[PDB]
Amino acid sequence: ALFDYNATGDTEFDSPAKQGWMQDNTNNGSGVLTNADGMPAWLVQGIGGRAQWTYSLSTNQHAQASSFGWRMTTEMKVLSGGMITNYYANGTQRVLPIISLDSSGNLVVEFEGQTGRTVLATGTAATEYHKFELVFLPGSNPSASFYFDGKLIRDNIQPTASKQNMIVWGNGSSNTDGVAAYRDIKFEIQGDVIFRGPDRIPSIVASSVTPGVVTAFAEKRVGGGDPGALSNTNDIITRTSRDGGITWDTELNLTEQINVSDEFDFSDPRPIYDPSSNTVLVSYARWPTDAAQNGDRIKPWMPNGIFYSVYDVASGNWQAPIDVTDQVKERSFQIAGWGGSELYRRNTSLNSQQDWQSNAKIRIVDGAANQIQVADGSRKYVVTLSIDESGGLVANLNGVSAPIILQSEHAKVHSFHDYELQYSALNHTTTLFVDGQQITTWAGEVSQENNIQFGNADAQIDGRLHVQKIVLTQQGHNLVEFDAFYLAQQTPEVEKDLEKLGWTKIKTGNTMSLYGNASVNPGPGHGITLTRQQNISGSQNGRLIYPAIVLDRFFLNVMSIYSDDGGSNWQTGSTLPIPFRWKSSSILETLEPSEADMVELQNGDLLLTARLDFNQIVNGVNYSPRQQFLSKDGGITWSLLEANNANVFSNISTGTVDASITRFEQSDGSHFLLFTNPQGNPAGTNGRQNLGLWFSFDEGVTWKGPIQLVNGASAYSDIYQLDSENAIVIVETDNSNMRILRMPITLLKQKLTLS
Ligand SMILES: CC(=O)N[C@H]1[C@H]([C@H](O)[C@H](O)CO)OC(C(=O)O)=C[C@@H]1NC(=N)N
Ligand SMILES: [Ca+2]
Ligand code: NA
Ligand code: NA
Q1: Residues facing residue 732 across a β-bridge
Q2: Which of 79, 104, 305, 309 could in theory staple to 179 by disulfide, Cβ–Cβ 3.0 to 4.6 A?
Q3: Contact residues for 538 (Cβ-Cβ < 8 A; gap 6+)
């Protein structure tokens, strides 16, 4: 909430009384409206008496200011004397700066509860207009900092005892003469509620093309629970501000229009601001109302998916939801030959004296020893697919010496491809096609086997492959037809077990296989539009991207979901690389990255920070509740940043919770990273308390802070640059009430520099 006086000659607001301020003069103290040079100002003439203006605040407003902070901004020039007192008192305490011209004619400041004056300006500048700012940060030991034309003058100013209760400006002394002219006074109370608990899971973005336009999101939760609870209906809600996040329009339910029979929960609103179109595109998860991500109750035959809505900033209009599920929710049979091998084989009756064809639609997720094989009673043909050290897609053929690089561009490397073997009876050789393109011809090797086989073939070579289709054809008839894309999404009365469908399973060591994915979910926070991708091969400026949560069957991980055409069509990247170990029980010990946020670094690399849910220890190594990852190819693939986990955020909470990360760019061209998360109470303990703000000035190698932003409850949060000097924060607080902070980043960062 903002309380202000703005000097203007406009007869409709041409004095402080007309703007709700109370006159508080004594004796010969007075004031008058002046028009020095086109710029109106209120001239406070505190000669022979006091001359000030006051604004009263309620008990609640004072309490809010104490919990969530406040800031006071004055534009004034001092003409003469002293006791120029612009300050805030809450009934028990005040921070009182006292501004004056000293006996040398210089502009100086003192603070009650402190000895000493500081010279702010000398010479002609002493009596010119300046911007004076007081910023109060909450906490158990809260303090204020004072800035002069944007520069930190005094930090850690302790509030002092006062029974006064008001916002005050002018000359607050009967005895001490003081004259000053005021253009503007602003007092802002931080932390206004924008979405009420038990609604949850906030996110926020701002428009750079139309300054002042801010759009925030949350889950409307009827019944107050996570998605997936029968007879309860969650929707996505949004509000827009057009004055920089001060006032907000009517809460709008985005999804009820596609929830007309109460069958769904929607969750995890993930907005992206696109400056090229000046739009906000927000993606969110759909769940059946009675099954979702928690407890892995969601299954691939259920209507989990992802939808998006578009906000046109110029017109203020919302575009109806659009389903992108088929583009981003993979349906496949997945074989993870991690620490083992798993193959499926069936005997066939191929005639090697007739042509035959096989089609396999296969994605290589990682590793090697991933095979598709046909033997026709005379010869055996096996294609082994792998990802090499540099991230290329490689085929090796039996009986052929040299490997074939099928693709080196990382996006295409991890995509599905259409493999076709065309056997020619005439030539007694087989031609390999990939995505319609003739690759090579080879004779395979002599064999009396007659079968088709696929999977991961070696217990000593890790590999994961996903299969959508395996077909074998001869004389126009499909001898074998396995459609995992189809089967993955059928209800459970449909037979899907390969071993009950005429295949033989051959397994060694430990493996995991499944029809998936069970669900995809954009996750909590905002996404980004890329602008520094010039030197990132395969990538493109204007890419829309967010780090989504994918549940394959029982394990969570994160992958990029992105669009290179403004959001019309979407693609998915690879999941985060994570360590694994098989426990004695043939149960998988690994990590589950979930709620994630990313930012584009100066060089076009992407930095990702992820919540690590459930188990955090793999092979005796504790990865903490948070882990950072780096992408060098525009978000297609990632690497785990060793020793860059919760440890880099000093005094961060030790409990799992969603965080936020974002870029901040100053008007002089410089930039740095901001990050928000609860500190816990006390800081560094497990608790959704006391939101902290961390800074990185070296592209995410180290973090400074935290600066405490909130006193009390603090859970999920999201931070975004509002303008050249401020960032806007939305944060869950008491009873999950979601509150707005508008933070003077360029002022606050000075608390972290040399003193
Ligand atoms: C999809 C979903 O239900 N996500 C949960 C999330 C989840 O339970 C944990 O990350 C465990 O995997 O945590 C909780 C949480 O407050 O810890 C909020 C999220 N609620 C909503 N996004 N609505
Ligand atoms: Ca987040
Ligand atoms: Na006076
Ligand atoms: Na529900």
Answers
A1: 738
A2: 79
A3: 409, 410, 411, 633, 634, 636
Q: By three-state DSSP, how is residue 72 classified?
A: strand
Report the distance separating Cα 614 and Cα 364, nearest Å.
27
Element spanning 199, H or E: none
The atom of ligand 1 lying closest to the CA of 656 is 17
Which pairs from 17-25 meet CB under 8 Å and 24+ separation?
20/55, 21/53, 21/54, 21/55, 22/53, 22/54, 22/55, 22/56, 23/53, 24/50, 24/52, 24/53, 24/54, 24/168, 24/170, 25/49, 25/50, 25/51, 25/52
Q: How far is the CA of 257 from the centre of ligand 2 (A)?
A: 26
Q: Which amino acid is at 635?
A: G
Rounded to 5 degrees, φ, ψ at 127 are -115, 25
Question: Residue 688, annotated ligand binder?
Answer: yes
Structural domains in the chain, CATH included, are 1-57+70-189 (2.60.120.200), 190-329+517-755 (2.120.10.10), 330-516 (2.60.120.200)
- Ligand 1 pocket mutation pick from 199, 226, 236 by most atoms within 8 angstroms of CB: 226
Cα 611 to middle of ligand 2, angstroms: 9
Mutational pocket test of ligand 1: of 290, 294, 298, 594, the residue with most ligand atoms within 8 Å of the beta carbon: 294
Active-site residue 595, yes or no?
yes
Q: For residue 548, list its beta bridge partners.
A: 559
DSSP H helical ranges for 350-454: 410-413
208-237 burial, b if ≥16 CB within 10 A, otherwise e?
A: eeeeebbbbbbbbbeeeebbbbeebbbbbb
Does 626 show up as a binding residue in the annotation?
Answer: no
Report the atom number in ligand 1 closest to the C-alpha of 556. 12
- Of the residues 595, 605, 633, 658, which is catalytic? 595
Active site residue 226: yes
Resolution in A: 1.8
